[PDB]
Amino acid sequence: MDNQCTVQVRLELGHRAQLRKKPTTEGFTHDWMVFVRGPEQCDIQHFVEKVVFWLHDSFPKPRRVCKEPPYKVEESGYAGFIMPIEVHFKNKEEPRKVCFTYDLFLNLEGNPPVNHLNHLRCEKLTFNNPTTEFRYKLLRAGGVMVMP
Amino acid sequence: AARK
């Protein structure tokens, strides 16, 4: 009715990868960066407490935490892998976070390997009847109150 | 290529 509120916010998850012309002493073959960012004219820091990137167990300190922008991780590696990415919200009630499963891929679907790639994934979050305090952070971050 |  007139009494309910729905707020929608958008996130982008992305990465780039480049094949090194010289493998490292460990045989790492690629340089890659994974990032989480808001869209044009959006500052996700107002409603995001932190972004956690869960790296594969082979990496040093695999849980990478970003408490302020830019939310990103830079690493050198030899294989693609699935990376949980958790976005923790500045909300005292549920939901406290949202979890994505991101494919950190170093080569495209086509069988031949490539020299470099990048990828962007868009995600829309919807919040129904969020708390007075959380609602403001969502909107202050470039969020959209859904008009009936 | 190689996945882990």
Curated annotation (Swiss-Prot), chain A:
<feature type="site" description="Acylated histone binding">
    <location>
        <position position="103"/>
    </location>
</feature>
<feature type="domain" description="YEATS">
    <location>
        <begin position="1"/>
        <end position="141"/>
    </location>
</feature>
<protein>
    <recommendedName>
        <fullName>Protein ENL</fullName>
    </recommendedName>
</protein>
<comment type="subunit">
    <text>Component of the super elongation complex (SEC), at least composed of EAF1, EAF2, CDK9, MLLT3/AF9, AFF (AFF1 or AFF4), the P-TEFb complex and ELL (ELL, ELL2 or ELL3). Interacts with ALKBH4. Component of a SWI/SNF-like EBAFb complex, at least composed of SMARCA4/BRG1/BAF190A, SMARCB1/BAF47/SNF5, ACTL6A/BAF53A, SMARCE1/BAF57, SMARCD1/BAF60A, SMARCD2/BAF60B, SMARCC1/BAF155, SMARCC2/BAF170, ARID1B/BAF250B, MLLT1/ENL and actin.</text>
</comment>
<feature type="modified residue" description="N-acetylmethionine">
    <location>
        <position position="1"/>
    </location>
</feature>
<comment type="function">
    <text>Acts as a key chromatin reader in acute myeloid leukemia by recognizing and binding to acetylated histones via its YEATS domain, thereby regulating oncogenic gene transcription.</text>
</comment>
<feature type="region of interest" description="Acylated histone binding">
    <location>
        <begin position="56"/>
        <end position="58"/>
    </location>
</feature>
<comment type="function">
    <text>Chromatin reader component of the super elongation complex (SEC), a complex required to increase the catalytic rate of RNA polymerase II transcription by suppressing transient pausing by the polymerase at multiple sites along the DNA. Specifically recognizes and binds acetylated and crotonylated histones, with a preference for histones that are crotonylated. Has a slightly higher affinity for binding histone H3 crotonylated at 'Lys-27' (H3K27cr) than 'Lys-20' (H3K9cr20).</text>
</comment>
<feature type="region of interest" description="Acylated histone binding">
    <location>
        <begin position="78"/>
        <end position="80"/>
    </location>
</feature>
